[PDB]
Each structure stands twice: as structure tokens, then as C-alpha cells.
Structure 1
Amino acid sequence: NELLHLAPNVWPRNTTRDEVGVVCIAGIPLTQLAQEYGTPLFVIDEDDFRSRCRETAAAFGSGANVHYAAKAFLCSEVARWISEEGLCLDVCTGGELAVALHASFPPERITLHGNNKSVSELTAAVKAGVGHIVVDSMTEIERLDAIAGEAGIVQDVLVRLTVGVEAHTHEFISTAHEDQKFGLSVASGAAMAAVRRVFATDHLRLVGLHSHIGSQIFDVDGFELAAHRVIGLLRDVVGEFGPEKTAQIATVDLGGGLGISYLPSDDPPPIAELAAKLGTIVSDESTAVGLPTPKLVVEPGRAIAGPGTITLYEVGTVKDVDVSATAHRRYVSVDGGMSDNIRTALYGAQYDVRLVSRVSDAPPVPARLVGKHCESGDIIVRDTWVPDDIRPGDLVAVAATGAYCYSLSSRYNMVGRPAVVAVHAGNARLVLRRETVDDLLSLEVR
């Protein structure tokens, strides 16, 4: 009756119900998937994922202007999808680049990020020919210049700014002095010094500016102020170097944080609308300081992976726990835990969970979804509702685990990484194996 609704903004785009009531994506009952591949189980609506890539690219005007943030989720399958849809790939560490490359991701379309790039990570990057690197310290700059000189090239490059804006959901914060590890403060002059240094080198080309201001951003208001501040730096730069030189700073990358719906209440604007406001502020602001509007880049992770994937669990214990003299909370324990979605513990994230293996007529009862580890804080969905006849053996699913869940997974209490599976049109295909005690034990020595 009430828990039977599967809100189309939360759950993947190809999700539907059986005639027997079972929940399907891409036409596959979740039961079949569970019985075939085990639980816990990650289930990626492949068509959804591409769907998001096309949609975002259309909104910003080309896949060249949308870099998938690999940090949300990465494996060779997904890299290949991103290539095919024509987006770029932002990679973060040595290893994210390694796997990008292993999947033959076109290096010209990679951008490298990080607060502490090593000389090896940077050297590997120029060898492969990555093409954009977003620099983050003055040390990085001295380091990359040496490396690109040593290798015969001029490495295009952006500098990362700290612009004093933090945005989440329908609000933002502005600070005099942003206190965090990334970027170079515009207000402090650190950013300008960075611009100066790169212009000065023989071996780097300054090509853009990068800002990132938060996550689950549902209004443009924060971006607007950020872009204001960011393009104000550009004004400082016409100041010293002239308009002709500063046009070479052709790309304003406004970072990630494009929002999705974890709960049906969540109301991120449709992406084309947002992007058109974004485009317009980059333009108003651009010309009211005497410049050609530079090209807008955006780096979603969550808004691309994320909605299209679902973690599929089997209920194993149901305990009814007294929380007042009169009331109860219905703890439903499950197959996995913080080993595969640590976001609830770590960020206080809020998820939708649903019985999926059947349809119940029972009245909804307040509940906590809870995993299998020896920590009381091992909690996947802190507050929901759940049909009062929920019972071991049932299959439940949590609704936007596509982003930052698997990437964050651990082997806490020796629980191995769930399998991951992709699904497209009717067909299912294992993408990522499930761990076994052999993996568990495989770093041990004699």
C-alpha cells in the first residue's frame, strides 16, 4: 500500500514490478539475480548509467565538458562505458590512473587530481600523456615542471582554487578563510601566486581554473557566488597579464556535487536547467569584467553512477527492540553492512530501503536496517518503515549505492566485497567477482 511506491527519481530508470509483485531492473526479477549471483549484491542498470552520461553531456553541450569523477566508482567496465559515451575521466591517485589505462581509456581525455601527487604518480601521468593535470600546491608545480621538461613536453594544467564557498542541499556557507587541504586561496593571494608561477615556467601551460564546493547541491546559488569569486581571480589576471594572455585560461571547471535523490523528498533540479543557469552566470560574470566567456566544465561522480545502482540484501534476523515504555523499533539485520555501505556511519547519509522479493499487505512499522558486523554503529538505513511481516529470507534493496559505496568498501570482520553485476535489456553479466577466503588470506606471507 504505502511502501509499495518506488519513487522514479530515486530508483533506477529501468525498474518495474512483476505480475507476481517482484521488483525488476532492466526486466530481471531481483530474486533471480540473488539466486544466480548471491547476496549482498550490487546491481547496475547499465542503460541508466549511459542515460545519465548522455543527459549531462547534452546539458553542458558536449561530453568533453563533463568529466566523470572516478572516485565515485571505478573498474575497467565503467571506464569503457565512459569512453564510449564521450566523457572525460578524472582520476585521483596513482592507481585510479593505472586502471583507467589498463582499460585503454584515451589519455588525452583524462584529468589528474589530488592534494599530494607523488613524483612517481606525476611521472607516470606524463609518460601516458594525460593532457590535463589540476595542480594543488606550489610544490606540485615545481615538481611537474621538472618532470615535463625532462620528457620533452608542455603539460597543460589547471590550478585549484579555494574560493570560500561550501554548498550542500538548499544552502551554502561563505568564509573569509577556508580551512581545508585542497586548493590555493584566492582571498589570500595564494591563487594569484600560483597563476604567476605557471605562466612563468617553460614546461607547463595554464589552461584553466578548478573549484569544488560540495556535494548534493540542489541550487545554483552557491555555484553562482563561487563562479563570481573564481572569475574575479581572472579579473586580477587581466590586471597583470593583459586580456590577450588571460584568454588562454579558457576553461573554468566548477567541480562536482551535482545532486541526486537518495530519498523521494530530495529535489535536485533537472540537469539541463541547472546547466543553463550555470552557463549564463559564467557568461554575465565573464563579460562584466571584460573577458570572453570561457568553457564550463563540470565533474560529477554521484550524479552519473549512483542512481542506477542498487544494493540487494537478504534479511536474516528480525528483532523487535523496545525504545520507550510504549514503542518499538524493528531492527532488520542483513547479509552485508558498513563493509559495503559505510556512508550512513561516515557521513550520516539517508537511504531508501524497500522489500523487493514480494509484496506485503502488512502495515508499515518503524525500523532500522542494520548489517552484520560487531559494532553497534553498523547501520545502513538509520530510520525507515518496513512491512510488519518482514521476515528472514526476504530480499530488500537500498536505492542509490552506485556512488561511493563500493569504492569505500572494506573487509571488516573479514567480510568480502560483494559481487557486482550489470544489467542491460534482459541480460545480466557479472562485472566484479565476489571475494572468498582466498582473497581474504592472499596478502599473507608464508
Structure 2
Amino acid sequence: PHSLFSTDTDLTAENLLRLPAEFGCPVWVYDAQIIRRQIAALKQFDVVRFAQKACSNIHILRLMREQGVKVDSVSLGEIERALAAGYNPQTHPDDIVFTADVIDQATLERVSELQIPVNAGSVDMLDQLGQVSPGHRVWLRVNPGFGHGHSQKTNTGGENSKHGIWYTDLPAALDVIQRHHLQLVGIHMHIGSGVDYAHLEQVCGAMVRQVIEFGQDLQAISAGGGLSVPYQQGEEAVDTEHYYGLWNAAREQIARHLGHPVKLEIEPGRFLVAQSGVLITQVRSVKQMGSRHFVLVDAGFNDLMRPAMYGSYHHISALAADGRSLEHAPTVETVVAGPLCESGDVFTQQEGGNVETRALPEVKAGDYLVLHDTGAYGASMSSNYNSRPLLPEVLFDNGQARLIRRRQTIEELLALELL
């Protein structure tokens, strides 16, 4: 992550300390210039299609669109978000793609009505779309027979994944395409390689193989997402030129097979937005539990779910309430936890649930903690567990912080029940 004192960005110690007083706490903060920087790193690709499930605020989608980035929707709600951010299927038919393994009635009606291209991840879904919208423009998401990581576990590919059309089911997919006269626009894979370039080349090689074997004309291919970001000190950042090298080479073999140019999309979520965001939360209780030193804040797993759900590491900094630097202060092994009435509400824990400590300055109630690199799958995963409201979101653009989401209210949630 970034240092709050080194800061070239707007995410400095001084800027962050003042935010809670103005906008409330806890609160999500993003730096627009960090998103623009991530977008620029993928300028070689023909299309950068943001996976908006990583960070869906409509103002951040507007910023993507401003920069020429298109958008992937995985639900009806995300379609409406893309439309509110100014994407427009009537004038630009490929600015929104609807991607999923399933499609429901309302979404079928919406994609048919607006003619939003559909990336189908199951043969059934392709058939349901085709039956109500003959000749629809589609993509095929293919599961190439393998995923990433432990392969017994829930996966983005392989047999223990729900995602995409199994590669040997392609002929049946073609029958459905032919039955409803569907128009094949492209073939897509989303597996995710991070910085494992050998794995990435297997995905690239599988796309070439499968596209060529399928033997259908198409206009584009997609590399999917899965670019990693270094959440921890010293980890390696993605080399985008290397990603481009490998996927462009795959696109070129395909284009040569087809006898015409083939567009190349990349569909990052995390890479574009993770490092741009932080979460500011106030220390409320500090206590000793046997040999553990506990620091409890006012944000919990309903706000940032990653650590509780996956054991995700997020760098943590402390900000003194009075503003004195804690840059060189002595540290104490600290367990950081939330306000929820649930045992799993601990930000410093490993995959599997083991509690762990973090070297941190010795804060007191009133001080703040900053959780770094929460731009991706932070606010987007939030829940209302413990009847806690969606937090406010703030966007920095060259020194100026602006509210891009107001705090949700308990009244708005009760309105659902006061019928």
C-alpha cells in the first residue's frame, strides 16, 4: 500500500484525519487520480471493460466512462447503475455487456428491450435469451477445464466452479446459437492469474485452442479480470505490458485464423480500483484480553467483509485524534476488531479464522485507523448486518473531497417493512 506521509496522492494523513469530522465515520474514501493511473496502465488493450461489481458507485462509473472505459454488468441492478452513469446501449451497443451464468425474467426483458449484448455462462441461459430475443448479440464465457488455486475449492474455472460453459459443452452451445439465430460477438474467459504468468499463458493458450476448435466467426475476445494488487509490503505488482504481450499474442493467432482483426478486451475490477480506496474508522474501545491487546473500531465485517470472509490482508495505519504524527511511534502487537455482536468481526485474522496481531502505534478511543486498499470489494460487498446502514462514500479529485454517497438511514430500511 501507500504511505500516508509519502503521499503524492490525496490519501494523506492530514486529508484523512479531517474527513470523518466533515462526512461522518466510518467512511469510504477514494482518490480519482489513482483510478486514472490504473486505467492508463492498460492503454494497450483495445477495450478496458470495468467489472463494476468491484466498486459500483455511479460517480466512479462516470469517471470510468469519462476515461473511455466500458462496463461489465452482472445483474439487473448493475445495468441500471451503468445507465445512471451515462452509458447508453442505443447509441453505443457494446458499452454495456451483461455477464452471468444465470438470467432471470426481469433481466431478460431489460436486455432484450435495450439490446444489451449478453455474455452467457450456461447453455440454459443462452436458450432462455434466444427464445425471447431471437438474433440477440452474445458472447460465450468458456470454462477451459481448470481454474486457479486449490482446485477442490470453489473456483473461477475447473469442475468445482459454477462459472462458464464447460469447454466440451460447446457443440451444444452452438446448437442453441443456431436454433435462435444468435449473433456471436465474442468468446470470453475469466479465470484470474494475478502475477502467475505461467498460469496466464495456459489461459491464453486455452482461449486460442477453444476459439479455433469452435470454428465460429467472432469480432472480439476477452481476457477477463483477475489482475492482482499487492496488499502487503513488498509484494509484486502486475506487469501490464506482460499481460498485453501474452493476450495480444493469443488475439493475433485467432485473428490470423479468422482472416480479420479481432478486438481484445480486458475486464479488470480490483486492479483499477483497489489501491484508490481507503476506509476510515474510529477507535472506540481498547482492552486487554489475557495476552491479547484489542483495538475495537466502529467499522465491522458488514462494512469491509474481506478479512472475515477470506482472511484478506488490508494494511492498517493509525491517526492520532490531535493530529500528532504517529509515524515513528513505538508499536504494540494489536488485534483489530469491530463493533458487531459477532465473534468473526476481527480485521486481523488469517484464512480459516485464526486471530493474528498487527504492529501498530498504541491508539486510544477517539483516534482513527485507516484500512488501506479497500477500493475493490469493500463498499460493494457491504451488508446491513446488525441493522447497520450502508456507509457514506467520498471521492477525492485533485485535493477536493466530495460526497458521492450519503449514509443510508435506518428509516429507509424500515420503510421496507412499514407497509
**What TM-score bracket applies, with the shorter chain setting the length?**
0.7 to 0.9
- How many aligned residue pairs are there? 402
From 188, 196, 211, the counterpart of 1:234: 211
- 1:238-284 Cα shifts (integer Å, max 9, x gaps): 4xxxxxxx3x2232212110111211232132323322233234435
Once structures 1 and 2 are overlaid, which stretch shifts more, 105-114 or 271-280? 271-280
Look up the match of 1:317. Answer: 285
Q: Which shifted more, 361-370 or 419-428?
A: 361-370
CA distance in 2, matches of 1:167, 1:307: 23
User: 2:325 is matched with which residue?
Assistant: 359
Counterpart in the other structure of 1:14: 9
**What per-residue deviation string (whole Å, max 9, x for no partner) do you get for residues 67-119 of structure 1?**
10011121221221121111111001111112221333122210001121013
2:295 to 324, 332, 341: 332
- Hey, which of these two has a bigger chunk of strand by percent? 1
Within 1, Cα distance between the matches of 2:226 and 2:246? Answer: 16
> What is the CA deviation profile of residues 360-399 of structure 1, one whole-angstrom value per residue up to 9, with x for unaligned ones?
2432221221111011110123345344431111111011
TM-score by length of 1: 0.83
Match of 2:200 in 1: 223
For 2:28 and 2:156, locate their aligned partners in 1 and report how far apart those are by CA, in whole Å.
Answer: 39
Does residue 1:395 correspond to 2:374, yes or no? Answer: no
Between the aligned partners of 1:135 and 1:343, the Cα distance in structure 2 is 28
| Matches of 1:12 and 1:123, distance apart in 2 | 47
Give the alignment of 1:196-215 within 5 angstroms: 196-198=175-177, 200-214=178-192
CA deviations over 1:166-211 (Å, ceiling 9, x no partner) = 2359xx999995222121111xx2023213431x145411121111
TM-score under structure 2 normalisation? 0.88
The aligned counterpart of 2:123 is 138
Separation of aligned partners in 1, 2:97 and 2:364:
48
Structure 1 residue 73 and structure 2 residue 21: aligned? no
Q: Could you say which residue in structure 1 is the equivalent of 2:267? A: 299
Select 2:233's aligned residue among 264, 269, 274: 264
Q: Which runs of 5+ in 1 are unaligned?
A: 18-22, 239-245, 323-327
Asked if the contact 2:147–2:191 (Cα under 8 Å) also holds between the matched residues in 1, the reply is: yes
SS in 1 for 2:347: strand
Q: Is residue 49 from structure 1 mapped to residue 27 from structure 2 by the alignment?
A: no
Cα pair 1:213 1:255 within 8 Å, conserved: yes
Of 147, 159, 163 in structure 1, the residue corresponding to residue 132 of structure 2 is: 147
Counterpart selection for 1:408 from 373, 381, 395: 381
The partner residue of 1:125 within 111, 123, 140 is 111
Counterpart for residue 336 of structure 2: 369
Counterpart amino acid of residue 206 in structure 2: R
Identity of aligned residues (%): 26
CA distance in 2: counterparts of 1:417 and 1:48, whole angstroms: 24
Runs of 5+ unmatched residues, structure 2 = 350-355
**8 A contact 1:353–1:381 mirrored in 2:** no
Q: Is the CA contact 1:12–1:308 (under 8 Å) kept in the aligned structure 2?
A: no
Contact 2:393 2:405 in 1 (8 A): yes
Match of 1:98 among 54, 62, 80: 80
Give the direction of change, closer, same or farther, for the CA distance of 1:401–1:221 in structure 2 (3 Å limit). same
Matches within 5 A, 1:333-352: 333-352=296-315
Match of 2:352 in 1: none
Secondary structure, counterpart of 1:412 in structure 2 = coil
Residues 317 and 360 in structure 2, CA contact (< 8 A), matched pair in contact too: no
- CA-atom RMSD in angstroms: 2.7
1:314 alignment partner AA? Q
Question: Matched residues in 2 for 1:85 and 1:257: separation?
Answer: 21
CA distance in 1, matches of 2:308, 2:154: 24
Which amino acid is the alignment partner of residue 307 of structure 1? Q
Distance 1:47 1:212, change over 3 A: same
Q: In structure 1, what is the Cα distance between the partners aligned to 2:7 and 2:71? A: 23
- SS across alignment from 1:377: coil
- Amino acid in the other structure paired with 1:73: C
Is this contact kept in 2: 1:90–1:113, CA < 8 A?
yes
- In structure 1, how many angstroms separate the alpha carbons of the residues matched to 2:200 and 2:415? 46
Partner of 2:166 in structure 1?
185
Instruction: Identify which of 261, 272, 276 aligns with 1:308.
Output: 276
Give the whole-Å Cα distance in 1 for the aligned partners of 2:108 and 2:156. Answer: 32
Task: Decide which moves more: 33-42 or 134-143.
Answer: 134-143
Q: Aligned with 1:313: secondary structure?
A: strand
Give 2:96's aligned residue: 110
Q: Distance in 2 between matches of 1:414 and 1:375?
A: 13
Q: Counterpart of 2:184 in structure 1: which amino acid?
A: L
Report the Cα distance in structure 1 between the residues aligned to 2:195 and 2:281, rounded to whole angstroms. 30
Q: Tell me if the contact between 2:254 and 2:262 (Cα under 8 Å) persists in the aligned partners.
A: no
User: Could you say what secondary structure the match of 1:32 adopts?
Assistant: helix
Could you tell me which residue of structure 1 aligns to residue 224 of structure 2? Answer: 255
Closer/same/farther in 2, CA of residues 269 and 79 from structure 1, 3 Å limit: closer
Structure 2 residue identity aligned to 1:96: E
